[PDB]
C-alpha cells in the first residue's frame, strides 16, 4: 500500500493533537499534554487506494526528519485565536525554507468551528489560502466536522504534486 507522510503544524493550543486523535480514535480529547510530539499511523482507503498515513503531531530529531521527509503539511489555526491565524505566515515560511520551494502540498485548517466565538472570518482564511495556492478547510476536533476532509484533502494535494 501507499504511505503518505503528513505533518501537523501550528501554534500551541489550536487543536493539532485533538485533530490527530479525532482522526485516529474517533474521540475528542479535552486535555492532551501540550508537550507530547509523536507520530501516529492509520490505515485507510482513500479514493479506492489503501493508504498508510504516517502523521507527525508537532508540539528534536524526529521533527527535523518529518519536516525534511514530510510530503504534506496541515497548517492549523483556531477560528477563535487571532494570534494563531497571524502566526500561520511563520509556519508557511518555515515549510518553504525546509523544502526550498513555494509549491509544497499543504492545507490551511481553521479548527474549533464548533465554538461561537469566532474572531477569524472564513473569508479572511480563504483569502490567505488563496494567496498561498492551497485549500482552506474548517474543522472541529470536538464534533469531527471537516476532520476527514482536511486529512484526505491533504492526501489528494500530495497526489497532484
Ligand atoms: N471546542 C473545541 N475545543 C477544541 C477543539 N480542538 C481542540 N480543542 C481544545 O483546545 C485545547 C488545545 O487542544 P490541543 O489538541 O491540545 O492543541 P495543540 O496544542 O495544538 O496540540 C484543548 O483544551 C482541546 O480540548 C475543537 O475543535 N473544538
Ligand atoms: Mg498537542
Numbering used by the authors: 1 to 59, 65 to 166
Question: Which text from the study accompanies this structure?
Answer:
The three human oncogenes, HRas, NRas and KRas, encode highly related membrane-bound Ras protein isoforms that act as “molecular switches” cycling between GDP-bound and GTP-bound forms. The GTP-bound active form has a high affinity to downstream effector proteins, such as Raf, and triggers the mitogen-activated protein kinase (MAPK) pathway. This GTPase signalling is terminated by accelerated GTP hydrolysis catalysed by GTPase-activating proteins (GAPs). Tyrosine phosphorylation on Ras by Src kinase is known to uncouple Ras from upstream regulation and downstream communication.
Our results indicated that mono-phosphorylated Ras remained stable in buffer for over a week, rendering it suitable for subsequent crystallisation trials.
